[PDB]
């Protein structure tokens, strides 16, 4: 089957401030893997933006966008985009979209568990109250 | 000039090593047809919404026009008889997959 | 320091704007995420009331 | 020594089994509890006089 490598990848000549959005992408990926650990975090330390070893930035952006849990269709949609900031915008959007759900689940878990703790802790207080009024005063509230 | 591959619920993100273990044995026939080539390779394409394997063999429109060719490393086949390795190495946008 | 603050400021602002445009996604999507969570840990057939 | 060892390893398997059953109990209880909170806070926001 006929195929051709029509891999368009235009980028501005001045490449100093253009990697700052990448810096925000890796900061969101660091926050996604720190608050929602999926894979080990050693791989993020292996491939850093400060090493100047990113010979293929398009590949680095795709690998960073791969941690997102967005449906495959979204990946196809990111490939449909031709401009570079549009795909960066979409990759960040995918990350934040997952991030809100993650934050909701985490807050809910700590909150629900603390509710269980406030349950049993108040029961511990009630148990102490009983015990301390068990062998201290013997109420004669019967027939 | 090979038949389309049966992704079968296996996303292969670009530049992210992945493994594919289809349950069907018809792709193994394709695995045996590419051992004679000197430079073997395999392509990875994506399926559209509401996945269905019978339309992939009937029609060729389910799969997206985009494709990601890459080279195979090595087979293992620990549990299944089809344990191929996939990678996102060479991206492509076919004009017409048909 | 001025150049770094302007770069960090423009990046934080552009990202805050993208984030605001993402918050436009409705809360129903969040409720659907929790819905899929309810089904992921529930399972079984509808053998309810 | 092995005669003692067989019983010990059996006890080890039995202990992990009883403890993991307690964990499979409570972890699933946390999941069902999360399910409830989403059905209460977000889903069924009615049910009242």
UniProtKB/Swiss-Prot annotation, chain B:
Subcellular location: Mitochondrion matrix
Domain of life: Eukaryota
Tissue: Duodenum, heart, lung and liver, but not thymus.
Entry comment, domain topic: The Lon N-terminal domains are crucial for the overall structure of the protein, maintaining it in a conformation allowing its proper functioning.
Subunit structure: Homohexamer. Organized in a ring with a central cavity. The ATP-binding and proteolytic domains (AP-domain) form a hexameric chamber, while the N-terminal domain is arranged as a trimer of dimers. DNA and RNA binding is stimulated by substrate and inhibited by ATP binding. Interacts with TWNK and mitochondrial DNA polymerase subunit POLG.
Disease link: CODAS syndrome: A rare syndrome characterized by the combination of cerebral, ocular, dental, auricular, and skeletal features. These include developmental delay, craniofacial anomalies, cataracts, ptosis, median nasal groove, delayed tooth eruption, hearing loss, short stature, delayed epiphyseal ossification, metaphyseal hip dysplasia, and vertebral coronal clefts.
Protein function: ATP-dependent serine protease that mediates the selective degradation of misfolded, unassembled or oxidatively damaged polypeptides as well as certain short-lived regulatory proteins in the mitochondrial matrix. Endogenous substrates include mitochondrial steroidogenic acute regulatory (StAR) protein, DELE1, helicase Twinkle (TWNK) and the large ribosomal subunit protein MRPL32/bL32m. MRPL32/bL32m is protected from degradation by LONP1 when it is bound to a nucleic acid (RNA), but TWNK is not. May also have a chaperone function in the assembly of inner membrane protein complexes.
Family, similarity comment: Belongs to the peptidase S16 family.
Name of the featured protein: Lon protease homolog, mitochondrial
Organism: Homo sapiens (Human)
Gene behind the chain: LONP1
Residues shown, of full length: 123 to 220 of 959
């Amino acid at each position: 089957m006929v195929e051709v490598e029509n891999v368009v990848h235009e980028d501005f000549q001045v490449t100093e401030e253009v990697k700052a959005l990448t810096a925000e992408i890796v900061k969101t990926i660091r926050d996604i893997i720190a608050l929602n650990p999926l894979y080990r975090e050693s791989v993020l330390q292996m491939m850093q933006a400060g090493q100047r070893v990113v010979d293929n930035p398009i590949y680095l952006s795709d690998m960073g966008a791969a941690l997102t849990g967005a449906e495959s269709h979204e990946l196809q949609d990111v490939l449909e985009e031709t401009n570079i900031p549009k795909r960066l915008y979409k990759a960040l959007s995918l990350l934040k979209k997952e991030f809100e759900l993650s934050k909701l689940q985490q807050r809910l878990g700590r909150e629900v568990e603390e509710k269980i703790k406030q349950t049993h802790r108040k029961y511990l207080l009630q148990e102490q109250l009983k015990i301390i009024k068990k062998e201290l005063g013997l109420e004669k509230d019967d027939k | 000039h090979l038949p389309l591959i049966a992704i079968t619920r296996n996303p292969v993100f670009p530049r992210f090593i992945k493994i594919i273990e289809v349950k069907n044995k018809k792709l193994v026939e394709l695995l045996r047809r590419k051992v004679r080539l000197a430079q073997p390779y395999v392509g990875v394409f994506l399926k559209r919404d509401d996945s269905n394997e019978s339309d992939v063999v009937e029609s060729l429109d389910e799969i997206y026009h985009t494709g990601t060719f890459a080279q195979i490393h090595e087979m293992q086949d620990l549990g299944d008889k089809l344990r191929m390795i996939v990678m996102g190495h060479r991206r492509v946008h076919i004009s017409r997959q048909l």
